[PDB]
């Protein structure tokens, strides 16, 4: 048993980058990596679809507001097609390192996350920041809904 995680979002947001970083000196395009989350092992199968579904990860760039709105629409779309079996959905604002070209604030993303029933987190593939945390939250979010 593995946890299938799909990566969604607009082009160039850093979907391939995050998946690539997640794996990951081990031994299991799809990326497989076993990780210990809260003392409990869990195998993840990261799916970079654009290159079933236990969870969906919607990635957007904080330096591109267009990808942010596109994320909201995808979140709405997923909702209106998957019920119940409401698999956990995580909103990810990638490219947090680019603090000059940022068009979306941390609060703005966290706001739309909570109102649209999403898990929020900002990551930086370039800096390997919150990348781990993201996939640890995914596993932690998948469980929360047996
Ligand atoms: N500065 C910075 N650049 C990043 C970050 N994440 C990704 N990039 C850059 O953004 C570009 C797109 O990365 P990529 O992973 O291909 O995004 P993608 O979502 O796979 N794009 P596509 O839809 O074309 O497949 C690359 O040049 C990559 O180096 C980040 O956190 N910071
Ligand atoms: Ca691996
Ligand atoms: Mg790609």
From Swiss-Prot:
GTP binds at residues 9-16, 94-97. It is found in: Cell membrane. Induction: Down-regulated in failing hearts. Most abundantly expressed in the heart. Also found in the skeletal muscle and lung. Lesser amounts in placenta and kidney. Also detected in adipose tissue. Overexpressed in muscle of type II diabetic humans. May regulate basal voltage-dependent L-type Ca(2+) currents and be required for beta-adrenergic augmentation of Ca(2+) influx in cardiomyocytes, thereby regulating increases in heart rate and contractile force. May play an important role in cardiac antiarrhythmia via the strong suppression of voltage-gated L-type Ca(2+) currents. Regulates voltage-dependent L-type calcium channel subunit alpha-1C trafficking to the cell membrane. Inhibits cardiac hypertrophy through the calmodulin-dependent kinase II (CaMKII) pathway. Inhibits phosphorylation and activation of CAMK2D. Belongs to the small GTPase superfamily. RGK family. Interacts with calmodulin preferentially in the inactive, GDP-bound form. Binds CAMKII which is capable of phosphorylating RAD in vitro. Interacts with CAMK2D. Interacts with CACNB2; interaction may be involved in beta-adrenergic regulation of heart rate and contractile force. Interaction with CACNB2 regulates the trafficking of CACNA1C to the cell membrane. This is GTP-binding protein RAD. It comes from Homo sapiens (Human). The chain holds residues 90 to 255 of 308 of the full protein.
């Amino acid at each position: 048993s593995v946890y299938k995680v799909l990566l969604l979002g607009a082009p160039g947001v850093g979907k391939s980058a995050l998946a690539r970083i997640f794996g990951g000196v081990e031994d299991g395009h799809t990326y497989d990596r076993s990780i210990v989350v809260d003392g409990e092992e869990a195998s993840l199968m990261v799916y970079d679809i654009w290159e079933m579904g236990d969870a969906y990860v919607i990635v957007y760039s904080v330096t591109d507001k267009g990808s942010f709105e596109k994320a909201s629409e995808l979140r709405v779309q997923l909702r209106r097609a998957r019920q119940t079996d409401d698999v956990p959905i995580i909103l990810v604002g990638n490219k947090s390192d680019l603090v000059r070209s940022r068009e979306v604030s941390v609060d703005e993303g966290r706001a739309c996350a909570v109102v649209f029933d999403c898990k929020f987190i900002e990551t930086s593939a370039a800096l390997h920041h919150n990348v781990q945390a993201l996939f640890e939250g995914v596993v932690r979010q998948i469980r929360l809904r047996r």
